[PDB]
């Protein structure tokens, strides 16, 4: 029931993605590629941000605190099984990929299978379904 602060802003810019001024904080971070729900809840919990703030008052320090949490999730006691790339078939590292880096790794995987000339690679090249369907 707090009055609008006149500093309320729309399309909050974060991680090179426009994030709606409305919507609760967990469901606004869901619009950043790689985060998704059930991860934005952990991000807000570990950044000390209430999940009932609706991005109306997201001061630059709070955005920076959020952005540094997602940058290194394991530094804030996020379990390894709670992550995007668990063991990285190429590098051999555990990390979380977000914000236009997941797509780059996706095209890296597709070309890696093509050079291998595995069955999954050739089916991807022809545009067919790679699972059993």
């Amino acid at each position: 029931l707090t009055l609008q602060s006149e500093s309320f802003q729309h399309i909050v810019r974060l991680l090179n993605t426009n994030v709606e001024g409305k919507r609760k904080v967990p469901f606004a971070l869901r619009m950043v590629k790689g985060i998704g729900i059930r991860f934005a809840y952990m991000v807000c919990k570990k950044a000390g941000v209430d999940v009932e703030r609706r991005a109306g008052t997201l001061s630059p320090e709070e955005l920076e605190k959020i952005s540094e949490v997602i940058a290194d999730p394991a530094k804030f006691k996020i379990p390894e099984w709670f992550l995007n790339r668990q063991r990285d078939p190429k590098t051999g590292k555990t990390e979380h990929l977000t914000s236009s880096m997941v797509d780059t790794r996706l095209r890296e995987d597709l070309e890696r299978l093509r050079k291998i000339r595995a069955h999954r690679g050739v089916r991807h090249a022809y545009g067919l379904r790679v699972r059993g369907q």
């Binding site: 067919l128 379904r129 059993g132 369907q133």
Partner: peptide, 4 residues
């Protein structure tokens, strides 16, 4: 399987 595939249908389309």
């Amino acid at each position: 399987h595939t249908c389309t």
